């Protein structure tokens, strides 16, 4: 917990660089080794609580156009979304998809505050592109974005 | 003979009817390698013919911070929104929501066979696609997505062609 919380809180985002990757646009490359289980980066965006039926139905219907930049989770009895659609200097939102990626999402708690983070699912070598499973997407998203299959 | 004014008034009413009826004939959806879904012509279109409306939620943008927020979302959502100025106003056609409409499924090319045009009905601007050259049945419809941010070009380098 201790060292991970400071990494989250400072927003240091060390050990990573942005590159332009053929077929993907921008992506994030590791510039240091990460060990299995290490914190890599926060999936940092605007935390939205989804409580309105209009918003809920709109987000569902926007899955192909915007769903690559929104990550849904439940925390306690509420449905949340980290909306990363806005350009910032944060790196989590530039990480590309793979079903067999070297990172995986986890909910991390800081005195109850929910943070969606990426942890290393295996040892990662310097020079590897960071990737994680974007998760559930609609049929239309899979037709729009067939790279979601792998 | 009907005069130019009557003939031009009549031609406007034809585009009006196509927009308002929302028929979208002569087009089908295909899955296209490297692009996802795209729209294919199933009939010939002639240069200048109405192809389809870019149909979505028309939003007047009235605030500089909102224009800035749209710019900041251009890589993530900008392919499915079309921003334009019309007289004193700025608008965005927000086509992010999945619907049965085809205009929003048309892919990009800088040298595409369609082009955008504004068409005013009762003071409301409609954004339409017309054919920029004769189009054969079997061709993918394509148009220029237009001005995009630098970040968008990095996210979407196919925007350059
Ligand atoms: C408005 S949509 C068009 C329909 C889209 N292909 C779909 O399946 O939803 C915009 C998206 O289409 C894709 N796209 C459009 N033109 C493209 C092109 N020339 N090359 C590669 N991908 C393209 C990109 O994924 C883009 O963000
Ligand atoms: C959250 S972003 C990641 C950063 C993105 N590449 C960019 O430059 O903004 C999501 C978008 O990245 C691209 N992408 C992500 N994973 C991909 C993959 N495995 N293959 C191809 N494109 C991918 C798609 O354009 C997707 O809609």
Query: Which residue lies with its CA nearest to atom 25 of ligand 2?
Result: A24
Inter-residue contact A50 to A81 (CB < 8 Å) = yes
Q: Is B80 in the pocket of ligand 1 (CB under 6 A)?
A: yes
List, chain by chain if needed, residues with CB within 6 Å of any ligand 2 atom: A 23-27, 68-69, 93-94, 96-98, 145, 147; B 75, 154-155
Pocket test for ligand 1, best of B156, B159, B160, B161 (most atoms within 8 A of CB): B156
DSSP H or E segment with residue A150: none
- Here the tokens at position B69 are 């927020």
| 3-state DSSP helix/strand/coil % of chain A, to nearest 5 | 25, 35, 40
Point out the ligand nearest to the CA of residue A140.
1
- Here the tokens at position B5 are 């004014």
Cα–Cα distances in angstroms (integers) from residue A131 to residues A94, A98, B87, in the given order: 10, 6, 45
Strands B89-94, B81-86: pairing is antiparallel
Whether chain B has a CB inside 8 Å of the CB on A87: the answer is yes
CA distance B119 to chain A (A): 26
Distance CA(B15)–CA(B128), nearest Å, equals 10
Whether chain A has a CB inside 8 Å of the CB on B156: the answer is yes
Distance CA(A44)–CA(A92), nearest Å, equals 6
Distance CA(B112)–CA(B144), nearest Å, equals 6
Residue of A25, A68, A143 lying closest to B157 (CB–CB): A25
Residue with tokens 């870019």, as numbered in its chain: B54
Nearest to A6 by CA among A14, A131, A72: A14
Per DSSP, the residues of A53-107 read: HHHHHHHHHTHHHHGGGEEEEEETTEEEEEE--S--S-SGGGPEE-TT-SEEEEE
Residue with tokens 């500089």, as numbered in its chain: B64
B1-161 classified as CATH 1.10.1660.10: no
Whether chain A has a CB inside 8 Å of the CB on B154: the answer is yes
Q: Where are the domains of chain B?
A: 1-161
Strands A16-21, A46-49: pairing is unpaired
Determination method here? X-ray
Count of CB atoms within 10 A of residue A92's CB?
Answer: 25
Residue of A nearest to B154 (CA): A25
Cα B124 versus chain centre, distance? 15
DSSP H or E segment with residue A132: strand A131-132
Distance CA(B10)–CA(B21), nearest Å, equals 16
User: Could B36 and A143 be called an inter-chain contact, meaning their C-beta atoms sit closer than 8 Å?
Assistant: yes
Domain A1-150: what homologous superfamily?
A: SET domain (2.170.270.10)
B-contacting residues in A 1-30 (Cβ below 8 Å): 20, 25-26
């Amino acid at each position: 917990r201790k060292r991970i919380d400071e990494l989250i809180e400072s927003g240091k985002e060390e050990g990573m660089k942005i590159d332009l990757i053929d077929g993907k646009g921008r992506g994030v490359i590791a510039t240091k080794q990460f060990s299995r289980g290490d914190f890599v980066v926060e999936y940092h965006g605007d935390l939205i609580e989804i409580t309105d039926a209009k918003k809920r139905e709109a987000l569902y219907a926007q899955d192909p156009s915007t769903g690559c930049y929104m990550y849904y989770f439940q925390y306690l009895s509420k449905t949340y979304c980290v909306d990363a659609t806005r350009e910032t200097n944060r790196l989590g939102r530039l990480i590309n998809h793979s079903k067999s990626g070297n990172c995986q999402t986890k909910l991390h708690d800081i005195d109850g505050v929910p943070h969606l983070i990426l942890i290393a699912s295996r040892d990662i070598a310097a020079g590897e592109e960071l990737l994680y499973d974007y998760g559930d997407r609609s049929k239309a998203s899979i037709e729009a974005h067939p790279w979601l299959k792998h």
